């Protein structure tokens, strides 16, 4: 007998019923009861998929917005500003609106969770959702194992007084109180017949201190009386021996995303006093795997239990209806449902019951000169050439993203002649240029009205990459993304933005920047082959992006912006593995940005702090970098002030693009005065924090005007 496990199966539904029910309820189109009914149909759908493939059925997985927030509610972590917890009304207020909790990436994934705010050191059992869901399935005659976020990971993903609760001394006191609630929750489940509880402790894979593990031992020693199964994933466990010494009868490990877990098990072994649950089916990549080999690993691991490596919700629901994919691709794919089925086949087998798309020229082309990663001349030399060619005034102004998209624009996109559309875009671009000239901007953008996503736009134009029809993946709340699929050698068969950029530039005398997405970002928002090293794929895409950079140059574009939000976002969970990663990330960006001395390269990143990556940022060969400085009132400039030898230009974002309230010239002035207390005035550009697509035209116009005015006052 081989016990099969599974978790994280998508909750959105094959037709995104989850999304429709959420928005319908928010819009007031359906009652809260109807919402519940819709949610229950999804519960049954999830449970039926599990039942048909594995032995252990999870429960408490269908969060109405975010499971981390659910955990916060369970333990009473409800900020005072929300008042008395009234249920869904309060729930959604914590999740969205003007008083909502902070949203951030869940580890190194595509999913975003809501950050709990710990205002009091006393947790109490506010609502036992695990017991509720447990009983709901019991009523339908189905036994289930509650899925909960562990006490350690919960605190690790939360903050107090605006700071992370990650230091042992910070967590110690809180944990004692926190564990108590978990104790009450587990006690209530066992009394009602719960046989197994699935505890998720992914934070065990972060670079922890020995001191953290001493805390983790106390926490679990107190929970030893309960039938708990601990899961860890996304990377290897920081301290193997300490983890396997934990008083828990069964432990799950991720043997897919890393090689360290296996090596440690081979060196130290696994306690005959516990059972191993082998996470051997990838939950973040869509490829079919040779089950004979997975079976070998299980046997080697000595484990008698299997499951997916990490949550399955990072994959689409099912491959079933993807019949318009390139030739030969579907047969090599496997989504959430197919993964579940892969675990069943693996179960049966174990119990005894039972060169694709490769471009040789391109691959070799990328494989074979250092100079490809280094621009001909150093910054100081390029700066002079560029400044003489652009002739820009002190404190130049610009924007670094897409402009708002009116309903007519959005509608025009969906609605039908390839010429009527291309004509509609140019009319939009034309108006965009005129508006920028009227307000007084110095460097312009074409608006990007023809783009819906900064990665899908290019993926559709890249060879070796495919797009799906129903491959939706939950991003956060009710927002879903459709990740592209890099299945073969990547190459660019024809210019991707020339038409739009060129046309925009012919309408004005001022410089219009090219707008591109970096290679690491294109790779990280999409699924990709595991047969070849990440570096290679990144380089191939970078090559492709560079060919575009050159066409823009030949066409006469004097400035090109390259957005690489993944620079830090795709960085490993373990900072200890950052050196290796940043080595190729930096190379990838530079290969794509390897432009002529006279071409001004702009790098854009919406990070709230550069203290931890400034050393890596410094190796990127851009000429100017835009940052978000409004929130910190420019204090975010410190990382740059303290970097001895910093000399490149900085685009200082002086307006929070996430707030509709127009900023006052006086407020923006405070930000600029702050940044120029140390750095030379010639390095400073003035611009908004980030993209403008989520804003309205009547909020932008005035804001941009106030920005231009302050620019002049500054002179
Ligand atoms: C991969 N994601 C991503 C990112 N930005 C960063 N920095 N990192 C990321 O991983 N931006 C896009 C996406 C997350 N954000 C979002 C934002 C909105 C919608 C959204 O509104 N989706 C619509 C469909 C939109 C369309 O394509 O027409 C939906 O129906 O959910 C999705 C994802
Ligand atoms: O180490 C991982 C941490 O920085 C967060 O990304 C967890 O969500």
Residue numbers in the entry: 0 to 353, 363 to 376, 378 to 424, 430 to 729
Task: Reproduce, without paraphrasing, sentences from the article in which this PDB structure was first reported.
Cobalamin-independent methionine synthase (MetE) catalyzes the transfer of a methyl group from methyltetrahydrofolate to L-homocysteine (Hcy) without using an intermediate methyl carrier. Crystallographic analyses of MetE from T. maritima reveal an unusual dual-barrel structure in which the active site lies between the tops of the two (βα)8 barrels. The fold of the N-terminal barrel confirms that it has evolved from the C-terminal polypeptide by gene duplication; comparisons of the barrels provide an intriguing example of homologous domain evolution in which binding sites are obliterated. The C-terminal barrel incorporates the zinc ion that binds and activates Hcy.
Structures of CH3-H4folate bound to MetE from T. maritima have been determined in both the reduced (zinc-replete) enzyme and the oxidized (disulfide-bonded) form. CH3-H4folate is bound in identical fashion in both structures. The folate substrate binds in a deep cleft between the two barrels, with its glutamate tail accommodated by a groove in the enzyme surface. Folate is bound by conserved residues in the N-terminal barrel (aqua) and the C-terminal barrel (yellow) with the N5-CH3 facing away from the zinc, at a distance of almost 14 Å. Arg15, Lys18, Arg493, and Arg496 interact with the first glutamyl residue, which is the only one of the three γ-linked glutamate residues that is ordered in the binary complex. In the binary complex with CH3-H4folate, the DMV loop is also recruited to the position it occupies when Hcy is bound. The changes that are induced by binding of folate are reproduced in the complex of folate with the oxidized enzyme. The orientation of bound folate in the binary complexes does not allow transfer of the methyl group to Hcy. As can be seen in Figure 5, the N5-methyl carbon faces away from zinc and Hcy; it is 11 Å from the sulfur of Hcy when the binary complexes are superimposed.
